Design a protein around this ligand. Sequence first.
Ligand SMILES: [N]S(=O)(=O)[N][C]C1234B567B89%10B5%11%12B85%13B98%14B%1061B821B326B%115(B%12724)C%13%1416
Ligand SMILES: [Zn+2]
Length: 258
Amino acid sequence: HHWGYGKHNGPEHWHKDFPIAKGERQSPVDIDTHTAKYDPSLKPLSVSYDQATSLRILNNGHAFNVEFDDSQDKAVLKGGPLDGTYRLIQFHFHWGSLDGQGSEHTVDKKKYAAELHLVHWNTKYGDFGKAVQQPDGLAVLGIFLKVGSAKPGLQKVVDVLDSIKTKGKSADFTNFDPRGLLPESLDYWTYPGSLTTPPLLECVTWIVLKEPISVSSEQVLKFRKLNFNGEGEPEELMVDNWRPAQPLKNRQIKASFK
Ligand SMILES: [N]S(=O)(=O)[N][C]C1234B567B89%10B5%11%12B85%13B98%14B%1061B821B326B%115(B%12724)C%13%1416
Ligand SMILES: [Zn+2]
């Protein structure tokens, strides 16, 4: 009886196996733009993805994951709220069954069609597994998707999804440049939170970009043809793989922009 997004194993059940689900710094959260405060102590954000080496794309039964070679300092996130250097390990999306839902973070309670998460670990901790035992182990760059014009930098991902339809399937996915998934502006909000999936670990410095990227209805429709189930099992479309907003508790959301 594994965790998932259904009625009997979804977000309202996760706390039974992962009691940190009811913790003091869970994600995602609603970003109340009027309560968010500009923070002059934030340094410029540095997203340095020129040398990123992608390896593989994987359907893990919850999302599709594009995985990178993180054995050297290549694709790194620095600056902003971060102390030190965080290495890109993978990215994935959360999306809806309909265009009106799919994001995990919300903005004044607005839900976007999807949300991209670029996951990075703090290189002072040596490896990802050690980083996830630290309160500043991870940084996730979150980017909202709205439906409108196509995102040409996404199409290579969309086009390989047919080959990883079911849980456990993977495909080679080299030479993919995640710079093509970024909006023009790096204006962002930041707060301390958690992974939004089990194990829900409270390691994450969240950096959520204000500017969404636009993707086409056809692009997102292809996300929604993936399957949660494995090959030869009854078809359950991979849709609505998002956790809703959690209590803000004793936190403040800071803005990089005035
Ligand atoms: N939405 S999230 O980025 O908080 N969680 C996604 C994960 B997938 B699995 B991979 B590993 B586990 B799960 B957790 B991070 B990485 B990424 C770790
Ligand atoms: Zn995620």
